[PDB]
Amino acid sequence: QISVRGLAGVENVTELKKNFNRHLHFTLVKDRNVATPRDYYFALAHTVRDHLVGRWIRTQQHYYEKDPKRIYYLSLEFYMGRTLQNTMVNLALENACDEATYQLGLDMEELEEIEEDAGLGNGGLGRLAACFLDSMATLGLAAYGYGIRYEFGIFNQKICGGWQMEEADDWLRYGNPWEKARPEFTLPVHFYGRVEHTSQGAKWVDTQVVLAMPYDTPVPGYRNNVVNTMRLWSAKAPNDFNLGYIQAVLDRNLAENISRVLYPNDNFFEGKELRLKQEYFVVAATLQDIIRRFKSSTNFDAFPDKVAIQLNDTHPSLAIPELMRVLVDLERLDWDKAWEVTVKTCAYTNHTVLPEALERWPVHLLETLLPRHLQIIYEINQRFLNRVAAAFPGDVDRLRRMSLVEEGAVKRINMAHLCIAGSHAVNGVARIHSEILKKTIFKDFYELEPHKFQNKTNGITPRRWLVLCNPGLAEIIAERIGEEYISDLDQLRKLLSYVDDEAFIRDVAKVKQENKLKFAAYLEREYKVHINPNSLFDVQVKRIHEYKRQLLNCLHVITLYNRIKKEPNKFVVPRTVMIGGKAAPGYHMAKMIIKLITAIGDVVNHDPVVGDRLRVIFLENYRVSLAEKVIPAADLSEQISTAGTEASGTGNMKFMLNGALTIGTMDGANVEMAEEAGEENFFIFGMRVEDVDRLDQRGYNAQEYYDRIPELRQIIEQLSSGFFSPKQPDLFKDIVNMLMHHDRFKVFADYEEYVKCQERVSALYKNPREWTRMVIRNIATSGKFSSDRTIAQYAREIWGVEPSRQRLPA
Numbered sequence: 001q002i003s004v005r006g007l008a009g010v011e012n013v014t015e016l017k018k019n020f021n022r023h024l025h026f027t028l029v030k031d032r033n034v035a036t037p038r039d040y041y042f043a044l045a046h047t048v049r050d051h052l053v054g055r056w057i058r059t060q061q062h063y064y065e066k067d068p069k070r071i072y073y074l075s076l077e078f079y080m081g082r083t084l085q086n087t088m089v090n091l092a093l094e095n096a097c098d099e100a101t102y103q104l105g106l107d108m109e110e111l112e113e114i115e116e117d118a119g120l121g122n123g124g125l126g127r128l129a130a131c132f133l134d135s136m137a138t139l140g141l142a143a144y145g146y147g148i149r150y151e152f153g154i155f156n157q158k159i160c161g162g163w164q165m166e167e168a169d170d171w172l173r174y175g176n177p178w179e180k181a182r183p184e185f186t187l188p189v190h191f192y193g194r195v196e197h198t199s200q201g202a203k204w205v206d207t208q209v210v211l212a213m214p215y216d217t218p219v220p221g222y223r224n225n226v227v228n229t230m231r232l233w234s235a236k237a238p239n240d241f242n243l244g245y246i247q248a249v250l251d252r253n254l255a256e257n258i259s260r261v262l263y264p265n266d267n268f269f270e271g272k273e274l275r276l277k278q279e280y281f282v283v284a285a286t287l288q289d290i291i292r293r294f295k296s297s298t299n300f301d302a303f304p305d306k307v308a309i310q311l312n313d314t315h316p317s318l319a320i321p322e323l324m325r326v327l328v329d330l331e332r333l334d335w336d337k338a339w340e341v342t343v344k345t346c347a348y349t350n351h352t353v354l355p356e357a358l359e360r361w362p363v364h365l366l367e368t369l370l371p372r373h374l375q376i377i378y379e380i381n382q383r384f385l386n387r388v389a390a391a392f393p394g395d396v397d398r399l400r401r402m403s404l405v406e407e408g409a410v411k412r413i414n415m416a417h418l419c420i421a422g423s424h425a426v427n428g429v430a431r432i433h434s435e436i437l438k439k440t441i442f443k444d445f446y447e448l449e450p451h452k453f454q455n456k457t458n459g460i461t462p463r464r465w466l467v468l469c470n471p472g473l474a475e476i477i478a479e480r481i482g483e484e485y486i487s488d489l490d491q492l493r494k495l496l497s498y499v500d501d502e503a504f505i506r507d508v509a510k511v512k513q514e515n516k517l518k519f520a521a522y523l524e525r526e527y528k529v530h531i532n533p534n535s536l537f538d539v540q541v542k543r544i545h546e547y548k549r550q551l552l553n554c555l556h557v558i559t560l561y562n563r564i565k566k567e568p569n570k571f572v573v574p575r576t577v578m579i580g581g582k583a584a585p586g587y588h589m590a591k592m593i594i595k596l597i598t599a600i601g602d603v604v605n606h607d608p609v610v611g612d613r614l615r616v617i618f619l620e621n622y623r624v625s626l627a628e629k630v631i632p633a634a635d636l637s638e639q640i641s642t643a644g645t646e647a648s649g650t651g652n653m654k655f656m657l658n659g660a661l662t663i664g665t666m667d668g669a670n671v672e673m674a675e676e677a678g679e680e681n682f683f684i685f686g687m688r689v690e691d692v693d694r695l696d697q698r699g700y701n702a703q704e705y706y707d708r709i710p711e712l713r714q715i716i717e718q719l720s721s722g723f724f725s726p727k728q729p730d731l732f733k734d735i736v737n738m739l740m741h742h743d744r745f746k747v748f749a750d751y752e753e754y755v756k757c758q759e760r761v762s763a764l765y766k767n768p769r770e771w772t773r774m775v776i777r778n779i780a781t782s783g784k785f786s787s788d789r790t791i792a793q794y795a796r797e798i799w800g801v802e803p804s805r806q807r808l809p810a
């Protein structure tokens with residue numbers, strides 16, 4: 001059909017159909033008189049999976065033979081989404097499968113919609129891990145994703161009467177064709193017990209054992225025949241577990257609860273025991289696997305030459321004392337040598353500066369659950385603080401600030417501090433974030449060890465985030481510049497020489513309108529809602545948080561509405577305002593923001609005076625597969641976090657790659673995106689980080705803005721008086737109270753400049769040719785934000801390995 005989707009050769013199409021029918025018959029045990037679309041999906045899934053295994057076995061064989069340095073990416077989250085189309089894309093099978101299924105009388109797109117998202121992540125951090133795996137395989141690194149096979153991923157969001165309802169994401173209900181259980185590689189993980197000191201060292205005894213059973217998922221590189229492994233651990237009770245009889249058997253569930261469910265918090269730390277168990281579980285099982293693989297190639301001096309462990313946030317921070325424990329207690333290395341090995345092996349990526357997001361585990365939890373690890377942490381702390389005391393003599397407050405152990409009513413371990421001490425590299429995820437790390441929260445650590453601190457600006461995989469979700473745009477680009485950019489996104493710069501090309505302008509604008517029509521159709525078909533596809537698609541999709549300032553978007557939306565009501569017969573650029581994302585189940589304010597959005601939509605969407613000039617849509621159940629549909633359809637990307645709060649953002653990059661213009665603050669990766677595209681091609685507004693600091697020193701008085709901005713006053717009056725909630729007039733009193741009195745994120749401070757900047761958006765949209773020329777300038781400069789670039793930087797600057805675009809034999 002289209003070039004980038006690969007060849008549909010007669011022989012391959014014939015063979016695919018053959019194997020499709022084989023799987024439908026032998027694997028699914030169905031005749032086609034009784035087969036459902038789900039059966040068809042599964043037959044296709046198994047057919048495509050067949051093409052992976054050869055490459056998967058040979059890739060892993062190749063690594064055993066060549067013994068390269070191995071990269072272990074430890075994450076509690078891998079937000080993979082669907083796997084079928086991604087696998088076809090990377091294997092160059094998409095056209096062939098499309099042809100094969102068409103000839104069998106099936107629509108492949110329809111079959112693709114049947115696959116459940118692997119929703120094993122909350123948002124940005126989880127999706128970064130997924131993009132990273134793709135890029136690592138594409139760059140031919142011997143890389144392994146290690147995590148937890150959660151039985152339930154991020155909850156499915158239902159909206160009921162404007163409120164978020166959560167339901168269990170039973171993603172494994174119909175099975176997972178992609179994974180391969182490896183019950184033969186089951187490993188014991190120990191919890192509780194106590195520490196016994198013998199003549200020859202400490203011993204961790206009387207432990208409760210939970211089994212860790214690995215499930216391997218293939219991670220195909222882009223058309224390089226490399227298939228890497230994502231290994232996810234499942235919790236299993238041992239067979240002597242609690243072994244009246246019936247109850248002992250039923251209580252096996254307690255052990256297995258460890259891998260039951262993903263904690264649904266984005267940028268918030270909940271100090272729950274089960275979460276700590278999850279964290280240790282993934283770490284303990286992974287490290288044993290790492291060491292097994294290392295021995296099967298006594299001298300641990302070479303360990304850091306053969307192993308890199310990347311800690312995705314502090315969640316797997318226990319890797320540090322666990323590695324120490326194994327090296328010291330089990331392998332009998334001396335402390336200092338073990339420490340050297342640990343430090344050189346481990347590296348830590350920080351993903352946030354929000355205090356409430358930082359992991360600080362109560363000492364009593366670790367005391368009970370992991371008594372040996374606490375001992376190791378204390379020892380690490382003492383030796384680290386001795387180094388600080390020697391470098392900054394007499395600086396007693398520094399010692400307190402830098403301690404891994406934080407004092408107070410409850411003593412806690414600061415896991416970030418642990419990570420910095422036990423890692424040779426610490427990185428932020430955007431240049432401004434990395435600078436904030438060195439200047440504020442980790443300033444002391446930066447002063448002690450400046451060489452540890454790095455930047456690795458985030459990226460997104462252009463495979464999933466252009467080729468897969470936007471084939472139309474991928475195609476028109478490939479027509480002019482060829483296919484090479486898909487694994488070398490910098491080549492998109494070549495599109496700058498087409499910014500005045502009339503045919504290309506027409507095509508860019510055409511691909512967008514097609515995406516918008518297809519999405520407008522998706523909304524009607526699956527959610528029965530009416531939207532004008534000629535309107536500006538103004539979208540903000542991301543987790544619901546106060547720092548992300550969906551509320552500031554809400555204020556603008558209400559402003560537009562009030563302006564329309566004020567002058568009904570005046571022309572305004574029509575907008576469809578789409579806001580989507582999940583609120584953490586216990587985050588009350590975030591749940592109120594969702595209610596507000598739906599409440600605004602209720603008023604706005606049914607006001608006859610408005611017509612189709614303004615629509616407010618809350619996109620339910622925002623997730624990876626929805627991101628793939630709405631992002632190619634967006635004209636305007638809302639990236640409006642208070643400066644200094646969004647470590648990087650990655651949704652921003654996805655929108656940039658797919659032909660949306662960005663309205664955003666100079667926060668996270670927005671700064672580098674503006675830098676790449678040019679500030680003239682970015683709708684930048686609001687306080688910079690420095691302005692927020694100046695405001696904090698002065699004191700933020702929201703009332704000042706309320707008093708001096710009549711349009712803002714009206715909105716607040718409307719909210720308070722019950723304009724948007726006639727039956728419950730005080731429903732939004734919390735939101736008003738928060739905005740007026742305890743707004744940590746200064747929504748009012750950015751309101752005026754935001755509304756003003758939004759007017760400049762509407763102005764540009766009135767001129768389609770110039771809008772599109774600005775779009776071309778964005779797409780053309782989005783190259784830096786490929787995760788291939790990010791991963792190449794990790795490889796060279798942290799892991800000490802060379803990426804490779806060279807193919808393995810097919």
Ligand SMILES: O=C(CO)N[C@@H]1O[C@H](CO)[C@@H](O)[C@H](O)[C@H]1O
Nearest residue numbers: 124125351352429646647648649
């Ligand atoms: O999800 C978390 C929790 O620290 N942080 C998010 O990580 C993403 C990937 O690095 C970043 O893009 C987001 O800015 C950050 O909030």
